[PDB]
Each structure stands twice: as structure tokens, then as C-alpha cells.
Amino acid sequence: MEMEKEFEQIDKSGSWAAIYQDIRHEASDFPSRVAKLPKNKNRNRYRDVSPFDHSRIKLHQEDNDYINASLIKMEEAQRSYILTQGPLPNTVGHFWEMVWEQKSRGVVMLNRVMEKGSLKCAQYWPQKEEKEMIFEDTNLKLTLISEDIKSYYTVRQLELENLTTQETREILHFHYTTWPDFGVPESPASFLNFLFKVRESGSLSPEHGPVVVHCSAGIGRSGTFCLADTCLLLMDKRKDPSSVDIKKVLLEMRKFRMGLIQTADQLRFSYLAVIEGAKFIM
């Protein structure tokens, strides 16, 4: 079926939970043996969220190459994304090592450091120009260059230096700051505006490594971001945009990382975002 009318048909029939459970039943199951080794217990935020072995990002280190991060490679859309968990106190150095080694231009953050009165990820970037951060385990230095605070999101320019080679790079930090503590946003308008700002920066383009995107677990909000981007790109590329099937795209992405889209409310919100976004594109 088309999307917008499939949408009204699920709303009128109140079957979002049943649609979402079908997706969960059909989703791929692949091994995640490296993630479950005992030496990696403090590298995982949640015991039930792990990268598959076949698509995990490897650090270029011979001691321990493990990080909770996956490469999502979308062949028809010609887009790649790295989805990862919010960094932990003992993985902030690994996180920036990955950004460096994978040649990423942008980092997309979809959570606040504290939500619901608890810490959802480490404070992994510097907050003042004159107070830079040094990650001694991976030999990197990170400096805040500039910051632009808007009503729904903040963009920061960062300088990452490889202290071993003295090479430097500019990284863009796109921080969506207004996703609610409970539920999903009422309108997709600010989320779509944010996605277009990431796109306009070049961070999603083939002349760079894959964008790094995260929330707390790296599957819920993060899944919504890449599902909406990929669906809109396919609607631009194909002769028949109404052939784009959001459930099929989601199942394809779940071949590369488990659990993408965590609730039926996130699924409905993803439909809403693609539907509204397709009107603005033209």
C-alpha cells in the first residue's frame, strides 16, 4: 500500500502495536559473540543491545578492537551510517578513535546528557574553548572551536588532533536537544529541519566517511533518524515514489543492527516524518 493512506488505515483501526510486533517477529537474528566476551562487559551500556559480529565497527588496535557500534550500509539509497551507543566513561577515547579511523565528518547526538534524572551518556566533548580534552588511552586531543545554540538544536565546530601524527580535522557536532523525556515529538517539523541541516553540511555525503549517530542505546531515536533519511532519498531516486515501503526499509536496516525503532510510537512518528518530509522536498 502507499504510505499516507496505510497510515490513516492503521490510525483508524488502532493497530500500531500489532504492526510493530510483526516487524519484531520478522527481524534478523545474527550472532554477537564479540560483544558478549567477559573482557567487554564495561564497554556495553545495556546487556540486551549489542552489535552483530558481521557488521560491527572494529577499532584499529591489536589489544582490544571492540566498540558497541554498527555499520548500516544501504545499497540502493547509496548511504552509509554508523549507529552507536552514547559513550561511557571508559569508552570516550574509543569513540573519538572510531571517528578518526572511519574519516567521519559529522556526529549526530539525539539525547541530553541527563534525562529522567539519570545519566544517559558521558560528557564527551569540551564545553569551553580554553578547556580542551585529551584522551590519553587513544592519543587524541579535542577542542571546541565555536558553538551555535538554536531553539531546537545546537551545532558545534570541533577540532580533533591525532597527537601521534599531528594531523588535525574539523568535526561537526549536530545536537538535537528537545526530544521529550517520555514519548515522541507531537510534530515532526523540528526533527525534519534538523535532518536537513545535517544534510546541508556535507556530513552525509560520499566524499566523507559515514556519519556517526547515537542516542543512549543507539537503536531508538537513532533508528528514526536514518530510517527517515533513507526513505526520503529513495522517494527522490525512484520513478514511482509511492513504491517506497517503510516497513521493508526498516527490516533491511535491522539486518545490520538489532532493535532499530524501540516502540510503536517511534514507528508511527517515523511514518509521520517521511510523509511530511515528502511534501516539503517538492
- Would you tell me how many other CB atoms lie within 10 Å of the CB of residue 258? 18
- Compute the distance between CA of residue 96 and CA of residue 160 in angstroms, rounded to an integer: 8
| Cβ closest to ligand JOY, residue 53 vs residue 170 | 170
Report residue 68: phi and psi, to 5°. Answer: -80, 85
**Span of 74-82, 112-120, 165-173, 274-282 interacting with ligand JOY by CB under 6 A:** 165-173
Annotated binding residue 218: yes
Q: How far is the CB of 267 from ligand JOY (least distance, A)?
A: 35
Distances (CA, A) of 147 to 39, 157, 169: 37, 6, 17
Q: Is 215 considered catalytic here?
A: yes
| Cβ closest to ligand JOY, residue 40 vs residue 143 | 143
Report residue 259: phi and psi, to 5°. Answer: 80, 5
Judged by CB under 6 A, does residue 60 bind ligand JOY?
A: no
Number of residues near ligand JOY (by CB under 6 A): 5
* Residues 90, 43 contacting (CB under 8 angstroms): yes
Q: How far is the CB of 14 from ligand JOY (least distance, A)?
A: 48
Query: What radius of gyration do the chain's Cα atoms show?
Result: 19
DSSP state of 209: P
Interactions with ligand JOY, residue window 95-114 (CB under 6 A): 103, 105
Contact with ligand JOY (CB under 6 A) among 65, 129, 137, 170: 170
Q: Which residues are catalytic?
A: 215
Residues that bind ligand JOY (CB under 6 A): 103, 105, 168-170
